[PDB]
Amino acid sequence: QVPTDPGHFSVLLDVKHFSPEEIAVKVVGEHVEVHARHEERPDEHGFVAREFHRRYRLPPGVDPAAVTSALSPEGVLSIQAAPASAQAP
Amino acid sequence: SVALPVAQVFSVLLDVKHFSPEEIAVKVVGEHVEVHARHEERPDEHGFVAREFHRRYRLPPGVDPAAVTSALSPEGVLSIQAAP
Amino acid sequence: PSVALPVAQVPTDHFSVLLDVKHFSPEEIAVKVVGEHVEVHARHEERPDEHGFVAREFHRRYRLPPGVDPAAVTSALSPEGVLSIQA
Amino acid sequence: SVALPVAQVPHFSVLLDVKHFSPEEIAVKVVGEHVEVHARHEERPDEHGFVAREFHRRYRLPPGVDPAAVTSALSPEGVLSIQA
């Protein structure tokens, strides 16, 4: 038994069609952005080229400097943002 | 009522539910069918998003480019078909 | 002499949906008409995956549009695990 | 000059997409040498439509982790996290 309380900024994104070299994550002001693009390449059906951009407003209280991101083997992008707090060792 | 099992059955199907019908262009180029879709940044549930893609399909042999038609379901599925 | 250029067109208009069900095998998926709805029922028992063990279930109903008869509903399932239902 | 190795030194943590799920629709619990997540959500994506999504996930715990350390939280954007 484990309690499921509410938490901090955190999202997941399906980006399976893009390689790690085709994905950029950046903090611009109060926003995290995600930009993904791949040039035309063949797939099962024929040829395809894809691009998207996503912007999320960082909630108040959240340190834009502690935004982390990670990509899973299955093509799942996560971005997390902890809340600001007093620096420590 | 009574459950009826559903009968299992050039033709392509594309999920374009996020694009307005006007944001989608389909054309035959030589022996290829091309589909382009694009929309500018607009809010959704999560924040903001813009999208684009381009797809190309080779027409199978014995299919006149003039036969190629396309349709869009209210559910946002693009279908492109061609008579042999 | 100019060479003609293709001019792109916006597509025109029946009921048609797509679903990604790759996590289920064909025998784990059931598609049926019940009344004025099409239904999709998928389930798989716990099987190991990348992150450990997972069991899944998915259910979906679509209201069929007016004038469309349940007799004319068909489905297809792609090698890529995409389910298409039309009428 | 000669390159010197730099070590990266850092634990259990997983993330699950649970958008639209109510916290009442999710249960997390430690059972033996495993963490378990049971979740099921229903809604009507359109007025006459219906969707139900259910899953049951079990993760093998890293050796020795006291289940009193196993915590969980749910983000506003609907990501469930479990840490140990």
Swiss-Prot record, chain A:
Record has Phosphoprotein as a keyword:
yes
Q: Which UniProt keywords apply?
A: Chaperone, Cytoplasm, Nucleus, Phosphoprotein, Secreted, Stress response
- sHSP domain location is 1-89
- Can you name a GO cellular component term? nuclear speck
Q: Where in the cell is it found?
A: Cytoplasm; Nucleus; Secreted
**Mind listing the GO biological process terms from this record?**
chaperone-mediated protein folding; negative regulation of apoptotic process; negative regulation of cardiac muscle cell apoptotic process; positive regulation of angiogenesis; protein refolding; response to heat
- Major localization class: cytoplasm
| Any one GO molecular-function label of the UniProt entry | protein homodimerization activity
Give the free-text PTM comment from the record: The N-terminus is blocked.
Q: Could you tell me the superkingdom of the organism this chain comes from?
A: Eukaryota
Nucleus listed as a keyword: yes
Q: Which residues carry this modification: Deamidated glutamine?
A: 1
Ranges annotated as spanning the membrane? none
Q: What does this protein do?
A: Small heat shock protein which functions as a molecular chaperone probably maintaining denatured proteins in a folding-competent state. Seems to have versatile functions in various biological processes. Plays a role in regulating muscle function such as smooth muscle vasorelaxation and cardiac myocyte contractility. May regulate myocardial angiogenesis implicating KDR. Overexpression mediates cardioprotection and angiogenesis after induced damage. Stabilizes monomeric YWHAZ thereby supporting YWHAZ chaperone-like activity.
The record's family statement is: Belongs to the small heat shock protein (HSP20) family.
Self-association state and partner proteins as the record states? Homodimer. Small heat shock proteins form high molecular mass oligomers containing variable number of monomers; these oligomers display a very flexible quaternary structure easily exchanging their subunits. Heterooligomer with HSPB1; formed through oligomerization of HSPB1:HSBP6 dimers; subunit exchange leads to formation of at least two different heterooligomeric complexes, differing in variable quantities of HSPB1 and HSPB6 homodimers in addition to HSPB1:HSPB6 heterodimers.
From the Swiss-Prot or TrEMBL record, give the protein name.
Heat shock protein beta-6
Look up and give the organism this protein is from.
Answer: Homo sapiens (Human)
Q: Which residues of the full protein are shown?
A: 66 to 154 of 160
Curated annotation (Swiss-Prot), chain D:
Q: What post-translational modification does the entry describe?
A: The N-terminus is blocked.
- Family that this chain belongs to: Belongs to the small heat shock protein (HSP20) family.
- Natural source organism: Homo sapiens
Modified-residue entries (Deamidated glutamine), positions:
8
What's this chain's function? Small heat shock protein which functions as a molecular chaperone probably maintaining denatured proteins in a folding-competent state. Seems to have versatile functions in various biological processes. Plays a role in regulating muscle function such as smooth muscle vasorelaxation and cardiac myocyte contractility. May regulate myocardial angiogenesis implicating KDR. Overexpression mediates cardioprotection and angiogenesis after induced damage. Stabilizes monomeric YWHAZ thereby supporting YWHAZ chaperone-like activity.
Its quaternary organisation is: Homodimer. Small heat shock proteins form high molecular mass oligomers containing variable number of monomers; these oligomers display a very flexible quaternary structure easily exchanging their subunits. Heterooligomer with HSPB1; formed through oligomerization of HSPB1:HSBP6 dimers; subunit exchange leads to formation of at least two different heterooligomeric complexes, differing in variable quantities of HSPB1 and HSPB6 homodimers in addition to HSPB1:HSPB6 heterodimers.
> What is a GO molecular function of this protein?
protein homodimerization activity
Instruction: Name the gene for this chain.
Output: HSPB6
Kindly provide the name given to this protein in its UniProt entry. Answer: Heat shock protein beta-6
* A GO BP annotation: response to heat
Q: Cite the effect that the entry attributes to residue 9 to G.
A: No effect on homodimer-based self-association properties; no effect on chaperone activity
Identify the GO cellular component terms for this protein: cytoplasm; cytosol; extracellular region; mitochondrion; nuclear speck; nucleus
Could you tell me which residue ranges the sHSP domain spans? 1-84
Subcellular localization, per the record? Cytoplasm; Nucleus; Secreted
Q: Which residues of the full protein are shown?
A: 59 to 146 of 160
